Motif scaffolding. Structure first.
Motif, mmCIF file in Angstrom:
data_model
loop_
_atom_site.group_PDB
_atom_site.id
_atom_site.type_symbol
_atom_site.label_atom_id
_atom_site.label_comp_id
_atom_site.label_asym_id
_atom_site.label_seq_id
_atom_site.Cartn_x
_atom_site.Cartn_y
_atom_site.Cartn_z
ATOM 1 N N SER A 102 0.842 -1.197 0.000
ATOM 2 C CA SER A 102 0.000 0.000 0.000
ATOM 3 C C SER A 102 0.870 1.237 0.000
ATOM 4 N N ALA A 113 -9.218 6.377 -3.455
ATOM 5 C CA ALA A 113 -8.276 5.310 -3.149
ATOM 6 C C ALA A 113 -8.531 4.246 -4.203
ATOM 7 N N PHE A 114 -7.533 3.420 -4.508
ATOM 8 C CA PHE A 114 -7.702 2.446 -5.583
ATOM 9 C C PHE A 114 -6.692 1.314 -5.504
ATOM 10 N N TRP A 115 -7.005 0.238 -6.217
ATOM 11 C CA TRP A 115 -6.055 -0.829 -6.497
ATOM 12 C C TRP A 115 -5.561 -0.593 -7.922
ATOM 13 N N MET A 120 -2.368 -1.252 -3.362
ATOM 14 C CA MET A 120 -3.355 -0.280 -2.913
ATOM 15 C C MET A 120 -2.732 1.106 -2.846
ATOM 16 N N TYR A 122 -3.747 5.209 -1.530
ATOM 17 C CA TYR A 122 -4.665 6.054 -0.760
ATOM 18 C C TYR A 122 -4.333 7.525 -0.866
ATOM 19 N N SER A 134 -7.366 5.862 4.165
ATOM 20 C CA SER A 134 -7.006 4.652 4.893
ATOM 21 C C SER A 134 -7.543 4.654 6.329
ATOM 22 N N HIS A 142 -12.274 -2.688 1.159
ATOM 23 C CA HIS A 142 -12.815 -2.490 -0.181
ATOM 24 C C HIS A 142 -11.681 -2.557 -1.218
ATOM 25 N N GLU A 143 -10.581 -1.855 -0.948
ATOM 26 C CA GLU A 143 -9.472 -1.835 -1.898
ATOM 27 C C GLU A 143 -8.811 -3.213 -2.046
ATOM 28 N N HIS A 146 -10.699 -5.591 -4.191
ATOM 29 C CA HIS A 146 -10.508 -5.465 -5.632
ATOM 30 C C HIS A 146 -9.411 -6.416 -6.122
ATOM 31 N N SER A 169 -16.634 -5.470 -3.389
ATOM 32 C CA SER A 169 -15.755 -4.681 -2.531
ATOM 33 C C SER A 169 -16.491 -3.997 -1.377
#
Ligand SMILES: CC(C)C[C@H](NP(=O)(O)CNC(=O)OCc1ccccc1)C(=O)NCCC(C)(C)C
Ligand SMILES: [Ca+2]
Ligand SMILES: [Ca+2]
Ligand SMILES: [Ca+2]
Ligand SMILES: [Ca+2]
Ligand SMILES: [Zn+2]
Length: 316
Positions: A102, A113-115, A120, A122, A134, A142-143, A146, A169
């Motif tokens: 992350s 925030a995303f994968w 990950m 944030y 985070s 959730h992230e 994914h 997610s």
């Protein structure tokens, strides 16, 4: 990095103290060796080049304001790892204990925030729409979910398959929040969303329409924004999942709740055994029905409740 496992202490985004697993070699790094092949947290330093640098700290104490998003990304990744291992017998996102990475402090004023396909990421938020993302255990889960989806069903991130991807997610984000059992709810992102407004959240699973998201297939979005509404149409599936767990009567259709644990078992099995990259909502219903049949039997309450819930949201 090579070093010895240590235990640091710090404060997360919401001001709460927690212990974190670190690694000592000259510095103390945010590297938790106690889970799989490690959980690693990086500083993106307000830039967008990833991952950035593995988080290094001189004294193993993480009480600075700048430290807070790192503390929570690192700690909540551990909780999420524990949920998948302990509840579903899944070892990290790939099922083979892949290292979990992350980065925090991504970009400036970054309200997301995303994968990214590999890790990950944030944002810190802009202080108005979000604080550092985070800080939400549901957000972190959730992230990471994914990543689980991408390694399993592989749901394409647009239109109905993408809305299922999103709902998966949100569902597991919420189940992880309940697993940790600190202020759990069926809302998404409430801990980090709109610090100036109490009582709201980014999405609601119990009542998606409160934030304008559909709670019935007849209200689905069919335009092109947001990859065909993946964060919008997820409400239809989120509502179905909520009903399966908690029960309710929705548009006149009554659903007998079967509880969170069974919801999680049914959806985890659907995700890992039945869904494919192109699954649509109807195919999700079929996958959930089959999963519940495998787990509980064709004549079970669990199967009947899955059918009721999808009926209630207009998915046949
Ligand atoms: C749980 C919340 C807090 C975060 C959650 N983030 P996410 O992982 O769904 C955002 N991801 C995203 O848009 O993917 C796009 C993407 C695809 C491939 C590689 C990298 C990125 C979300 O709902 N984001 C949408 C926020 C918005 C734009 C509605 C305010
Ligand atoms: Ca320190
Ligand atoms: Ca909560
Ligand atoms: Ca929540
Ligand atoms: Ca708020
Ligand atoms: Zn998402």
């Amino acid at each position: 990095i090579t070093g010895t496992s240590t235990v640091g202490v710090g404060r997360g985004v919401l001001g709460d103290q927690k212990n974190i697993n670190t690694t000592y070699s000259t510095y103390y790094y945010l590297q938790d060796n106690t889970r799989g092949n490690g959980i690693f947290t990086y500083d993106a330093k307000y830039r967008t080049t990833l991952p950035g640098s593995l988080w290094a700290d001189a004294d193993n104490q993480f009480f600075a304001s700048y430290d807070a998003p790192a503390v929570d990304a690192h700690y909540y990744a551990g909780v999420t790892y524990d949920y998948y291992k302990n509840v579903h017998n899944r070892l990290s996102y790939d099922g083979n204990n892949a290292a979990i990475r992350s980065s925090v402090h991504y970009s400036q004023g970054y309200n997301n925030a995303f994968w990214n396909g590999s890790q990950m990421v944030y944002g810190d938020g802009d202080g108005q729409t979000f604080i550092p993302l985070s800080g939400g255990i549901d957000v972190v889960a959730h992230e990471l979910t994914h990543a689980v989806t991408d390694y399993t069903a592989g749901l394409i991130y647009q239109n109905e398959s993408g809305a299922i991807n999103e709902a998966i997610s949100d569902i597991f984000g919420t189940l992880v929040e309940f697993y940790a059992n600190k202020n759990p709810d069926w809302e998404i992102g409430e801990d980090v969303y709109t610090p100036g407004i109490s009582g709201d959240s980014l999405r609601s699973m119990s009542d998606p329409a409160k934030y304008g998201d559909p709670d019935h297939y007849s209200k689905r979005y069919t335009g092109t924004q947001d990859n065909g509404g993946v964060h919008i149409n997820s409400g239809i599936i989120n509502k179905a999942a909520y009903l399966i767990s908690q029960g309710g009567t929705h548009y006149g259709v009554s659903v007998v709740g079967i509880g969170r644990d069974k919801l999680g078992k049914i959806f985890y099995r659907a995700l890992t055994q039945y869904l494919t990259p192109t699954s649509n909502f109807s195919q999700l219903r079929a996958a959930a029905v089959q999963s519940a049949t495998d787990l509980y039997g064709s004549t079970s309450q669990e199967v009947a409740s899955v059918k009721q819930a999808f009926d209630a949201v207009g998915v046949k």
